Homo-oligomer: 160 residues x 12
Amino acid sequence: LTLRALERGDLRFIHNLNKELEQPYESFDELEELYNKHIHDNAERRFVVEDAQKNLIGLVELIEINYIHRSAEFQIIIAPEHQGKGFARTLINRALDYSFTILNLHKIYLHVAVENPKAVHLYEECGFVEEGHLVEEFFINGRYQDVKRMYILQSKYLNR
Amino acid sequence: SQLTLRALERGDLRFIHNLNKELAYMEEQPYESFDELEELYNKHIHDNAERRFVVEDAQKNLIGLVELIEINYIHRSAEFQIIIAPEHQGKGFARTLINRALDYSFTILNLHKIYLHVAVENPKAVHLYEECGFVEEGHLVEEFFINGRYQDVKRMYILQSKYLNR
Amino acid sequence: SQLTLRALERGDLRFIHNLNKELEEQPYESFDELEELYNKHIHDNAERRFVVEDAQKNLIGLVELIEINYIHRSAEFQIIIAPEHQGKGFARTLINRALDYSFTILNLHKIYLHVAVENPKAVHLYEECGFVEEGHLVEEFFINGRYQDVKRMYILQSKYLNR
Amino acid sequence: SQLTLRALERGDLRFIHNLNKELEEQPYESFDELEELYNKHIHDNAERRFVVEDAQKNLIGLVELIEINYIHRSAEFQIIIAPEHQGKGFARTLINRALDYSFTILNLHKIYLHVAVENPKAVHLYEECGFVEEGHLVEEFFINGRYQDVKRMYILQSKYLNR
Amino acid sequence: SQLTLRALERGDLRFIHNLNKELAYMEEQPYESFDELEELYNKHIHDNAERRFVVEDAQKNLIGLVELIEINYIHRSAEFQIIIAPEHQGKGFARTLINRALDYSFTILNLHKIYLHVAVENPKAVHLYEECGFVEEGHLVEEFFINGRYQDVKRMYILQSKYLNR
Amino acid sequence: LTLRALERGDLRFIHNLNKELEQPYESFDELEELYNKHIHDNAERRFVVEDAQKNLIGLVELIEINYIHRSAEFQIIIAPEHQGKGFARTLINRALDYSFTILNLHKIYLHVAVENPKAVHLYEECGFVEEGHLVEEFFINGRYQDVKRMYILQSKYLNR
Amino acid sequence: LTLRALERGDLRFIHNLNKELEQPYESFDELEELYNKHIHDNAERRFVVEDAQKNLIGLVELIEINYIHRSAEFQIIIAPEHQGKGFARTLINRALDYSFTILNLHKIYLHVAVENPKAVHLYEECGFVEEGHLVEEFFINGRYQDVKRMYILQSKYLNR
Amino acid sequence: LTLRALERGDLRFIHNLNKELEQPYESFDELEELYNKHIHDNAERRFVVEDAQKNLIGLVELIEINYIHRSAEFQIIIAPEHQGKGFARTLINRALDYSFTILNLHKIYLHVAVENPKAVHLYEECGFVEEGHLVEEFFINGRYQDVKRMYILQSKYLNR
Amino acid sequence: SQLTLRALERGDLRFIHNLNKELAYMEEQPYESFDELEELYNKHIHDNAERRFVVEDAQKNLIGLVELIEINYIHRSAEFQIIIAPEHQGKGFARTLINRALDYSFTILNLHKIYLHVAVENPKAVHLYEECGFVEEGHLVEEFFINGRYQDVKRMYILQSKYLNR
Amino acid sequence: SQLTLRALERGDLRFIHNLNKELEEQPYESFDELEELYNKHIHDNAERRFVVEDAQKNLIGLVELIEINYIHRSAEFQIIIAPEHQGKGFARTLINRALDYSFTILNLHKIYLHVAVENPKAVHLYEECGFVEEGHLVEEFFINGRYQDVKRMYILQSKYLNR
Amino acid sequence: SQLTLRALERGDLRFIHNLNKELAYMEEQPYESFDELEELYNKHIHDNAERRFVVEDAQKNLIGLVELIEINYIHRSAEFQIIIAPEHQGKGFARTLINRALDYSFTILNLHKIYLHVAVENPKAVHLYEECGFVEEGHLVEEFFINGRYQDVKRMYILQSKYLNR
Amino acid sequence: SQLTLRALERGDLRFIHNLNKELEEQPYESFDELEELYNKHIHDNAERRFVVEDAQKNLIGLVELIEINYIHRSAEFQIIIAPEHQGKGFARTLINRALDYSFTILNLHKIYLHVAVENPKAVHLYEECGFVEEGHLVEEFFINGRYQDVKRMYILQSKYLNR
């Protein structure tokens, strides 16, 4: 599985990929114009993961890149077809590899719903550690829910 | 739930234009130009004060349109509008799309109040929204000029709390 | 009749341009000027340009409302019928179709129009359609190498709604 | 009274900004946003913002018409009086001054407005000025850490002109 | 002829704004914003379809305004408008400025017809224009909404040939 | 033969038509962009003359339209194929008909090389009269040449 | 002490106010142009606190306003002259009052350096509660430092 | 008397100077904006004539400059104060001097009302010769009038 | 005269780009990007200070290019440049296109002087222009850097009077 | 060899993008950023980007000159060879082709470049091509999760022209 | 530490222009136009790749300028430049402003490496930077053309780790 | 002399405009054209316009470099001296000041200029300043109603640096 930069040609597929069960209700024209607005935005990175047969496995994103503090929020989404194939670990470390060996970032953090303990333990297996329990951070499905903020530092990923 | 909501996009504007030409019809200007419709659409792609959703079935046959306009994020309110093609008006899709819109308004968009305007001389629509949980909060006197005469319209609402509590 | 009032859009300008060549400067208007001027008035709420067609999508004519005031609730009505259907009897149909839109939808109070004094049959046709002379504009327009008079005829909303 | 209805212009925004600080988000609005938003609506025919003042150029209040439709001929009326003249009895004067403009100049058919249900004296004042309740909007606005109800009251042109 | 016509310019807009606030007054919107007046002026500086002239006396005391709008260069027609400050309305300047405008229209601008609209309920203005050579060509029924009622207005004209021939 | 307004679609043909023996050396891109600049120019009129089978006979133009003086310069060009067919008279009066009966102009003038006495007499047959002999007005083919300025008024054309 | 919206006229004072011991090294022209860019930005609020004699006490800011989740980050800065006068509590609740009674927000969170336990306890007195301990979040004075993320909800502030 | 290029500072004076007995009825804002539009217009020249005490005597203009035919229309206007002082001859030859010795033009022509025989003879004294009698060219004071088109060539002015 | 001059246009830019890649070659930057060539062309469509002409035969086979740059309309001067594809360099088209350009410069554009620059180390071109009427007016020392060394170039001219008089 | 130095144009960006994916951030660069950044530098006289290809139009590599000063007449030279032809011996050919353009056409005085200290064979190849070490930049770039040193090597016009 | 760093702003450009006219002077173009300086400044107000700081004393007497250019946020590097008015060049302010810039680079901006270029024929500056912790990493041969001859320049650096560890 | 070479900026255009009125079209150039053309070339690296002044800020003249190539490293030098100091002996000073900038700062290779053949003293002055005739342009410029010849004189960097 390779890590490629997302380009305008991939927007149609991710638009249908977002439709899972905010983003599912986004107009494609808004998605495209917003993509055009962030072409040169150095504060974000949008990568599409594909296999040898150029099949879109998922999307890994880095947002809120600071460069002074050298931190960035991490996000990942895998198409329903490839959820249970065990790609998550590979894509996570693939994004951490780019963040710590190429972009030279110091910290990578992410948010996960407290009501998804399987996802929490997954990131724990990839090296992430809980640093916060945000109370009623996001309003998800008719109710406010807590989310875990988990992080991992450059030194730890490099000294595995 | 065999129908699906989907964000309106440029490719559907031609369908919307032909759809707005109804005779059943509370539609003010079915005599709008497609170019005015398209350009006005382009001006509201990033308008976070509205949400327009196309309704389509399993085979992607565009059924109708559901809209949330005048979205105020301090008062957590928004006006609701819905139109269904005359071909499927009798198949009972309305109350499904009404409840689907309310679900998005109250569970995703986190709105507090959803209101709508209905012509008093359309009791079929009034009683329908009542079944879907809407309650009358106003009887606007001579609010809209419709077919050569001023007519009254009901303003009806539904609150987030009531919807999220059976 | 089984005619419909559709909004003029860019896709019809080509047919309108060829139709404008009748026997105004419009017959001698470049299509590029017609299209660019159309684009400039797409959001001009002071005008309305509707294409009238039958069930077979055949363009019968073009009805227009201009100089819409919205305070005085008046507007100038103009009409043109394709040379093919000029004497078929659609004029009265499209006229009452334009008055129906003006008085039952746009909620206007007065619809006026100009008719060449040198066209008595046209003046008397509008009178049969409810219009009434309110002015005899002397040498208002220069038409065919000669200044001509035009009748200004009007119709009020109350009169049309209480037929 | 000897009050006059003047058009709000850029030269008054500073006074309006200080006046907006009462006890809406307007009290907490940056003047730069007020001025730039004013510039964007200079040609917005769907709104009217008039400054009401006396013979001595003293600003008594600000009357506004918004959501003007021109097809339905309706508009929302809003009013604010400077804290100095709130209990002096100008409210009824400026209200009938706004209805005079709406019904004798702009030729509107209906003027409606929202009044907090928690302000009975205000609701009954508009009723004395000819308005009538047509709606009781439940939890329409979030005011002072609490959703409040508002009365929607209207007045028709025919009623105001035949006093 | 002690008065002088002069092309309107930005510096006179403030006077025009205060002037339009008349009570004598056929002025539709004396409640216009000075900013709307100024910006609309800037948009018509090169509009060859209008001519706006400020009237001033020997000491450059701006008396009023004379306008030619809707100038059509194929039909050689234009609408005429005039306003005089309430201070000098009774000094008979009107017929002087009316004939001065007609002179510019027919001897300089080379127009063929000059028309104007007058409220039927203002006979003082109607008979005044008649004296200046204007003739009635129309009695427009309920043309303008004025002070809570639709009112008729006279449309009156004068031709270049008649003016240039005593 | 009908009188039609020139549109962007006719530019390619007139570009080749101009190549006869200034304009012959004009870039098509300049011709098109200049045409775009004068779409709404009320001071000029560009008409293409065509037959029943929509064949471009020539081009008649009105430039320097004043509207105060109600004058305009007249120009005409016929493709080499239709020069000797006697269309010139028809197109000239066709342009005069539009100028005097539709556009309501007062005077129509034109310039013709003094070394083209056949063209001078042609316009004399169509009603034009010499009003000037401009000395060395234009530099044509390596030498300055005189041109006749000929005119015709609205009253004369209407009272034939 | 009143809460007023920051306007272009106050930029010069806050520029000197920022100079305390990132922002202290910002060009005034950048500060002004960035202020012009966020005039209509509904995702932030910039308020200046002033006393009865219109003296700039400090600045309270709300950023990252969501409106769907109804959360926003809170920031406050008091001029060195008025630090020890005990205004912090008033300004904090003044900003919470605007967020919960006017803007109708649900959650207000903030970040404080773990090496500032006095500030932590202050927000604890104003109703804030720790929800996270971000490890090496910010690089402050030649070293990465931890910060506490503290929050307070609308229901709690209203039901005091 | 010196020949200076007209700049925006002189617009107010010429505006009042134009008011004599089209231009007298021009708005100053139109005059200024039109001046701004022709700053770099190489097809025209606008010169103001002034005396030793920098008093605006008049204005001489060259318009319709061709550069291929090397022709240009000449125009002159003297303030009423200096009409009878005999400056016209000087300013005329001053403009001809610039046209033939600096701008390297070939022909200079002008239009004069036939009902101004004194002006016609003046240009005849300065070297101009009648080349046309334009019938009813301009509509002046309620009637169409004829005008003389008079010219003078570069070789003649240089070989005086 | 079987060849024909024709105004350069966008459609010929690709040919010009491939043509400029000569090895025979006094062409400074044959390593120019087609996009730079096209955009620079778009910026000079209305530049009246240059004239670029494509040369084509009866079958419209683009032979080469003839240019007039630095056209000054006060001094009536312009620089002349010409390039012929290596395929037809030996067929003697040069002196035909040189005389065709001079004809346009002196009989149509009405220029007074046409000059050009030639590398001293290209006597074939120098003597060719001499035959076409050009005369040397300067031997510019180390004017251009060409292939790792500064080289001299001849500046040669021809006047309108001489050309128009056999 | 029978290679040619062609100017990089928009038609090649797609091939370059796929070629940039080697084993810099360029492999992870969106094509839209590559194309828009290319458009912004079409007229940037401080850079040169040439495509090197053979007679069969096969892209062998890409030579670049950046930071061109024109007062100091210096520029940084960069080179990349397609993975297919990396060990075929084109490196020395394209290097001397870039020096020929810099010194015999653009008339530059000095050409420098950076070479990873962890690539001795590369440093010694440039030395064989006439370059000479003038700097050992300590921890200049962060490459592969580690700050690496780079040799800065230069070559003067006079030396290349007098081989 | 009586001096203070402060972000450059438009009001100081005139001082910078007069300051750049040095004779002591490694300044390439002291013949730059103030308008070019001002417009170039306006184009880099939001350029996060540079940091320009004006130095002033207690009484706000602008002493000199300190710059960080070519700031790369992946490699955490930046070039350092400094200029002090000839009036205070001998008062030893340099090493204070050098260490103040390094402090901002390593403790606030969190940079990893700070390098600079110095003319070999200015040993006073070379040895000064050495005292401030800079170390030579390159002797660039004929790097800059200075006063009619190509001259060498030292490239010297200092790392964040060394600076933050006594 | 104690003269200095300063960059021409907008603040001097007024003085330059009055100075341009000497005995080119510049004397007859509108100041607005001078200022707007100046703005368009503020970042034009192909030109240089320096004001030469003494210690008392008195403008002695204006030296200019145009048509700067940077590949061929050539440029046209132009000079003008205020009528007040034309015969005072500053010409040779400003000429060598312009050559010093061209050859010791901008690193140009050749400086050429045009001198009217009808001004022998000027041609011989440049020859004394190191220039040499390389062309006799026949009827290059139309000056004072007559086409005049101009000498094109040059000077190389190597010659000026090795005086």
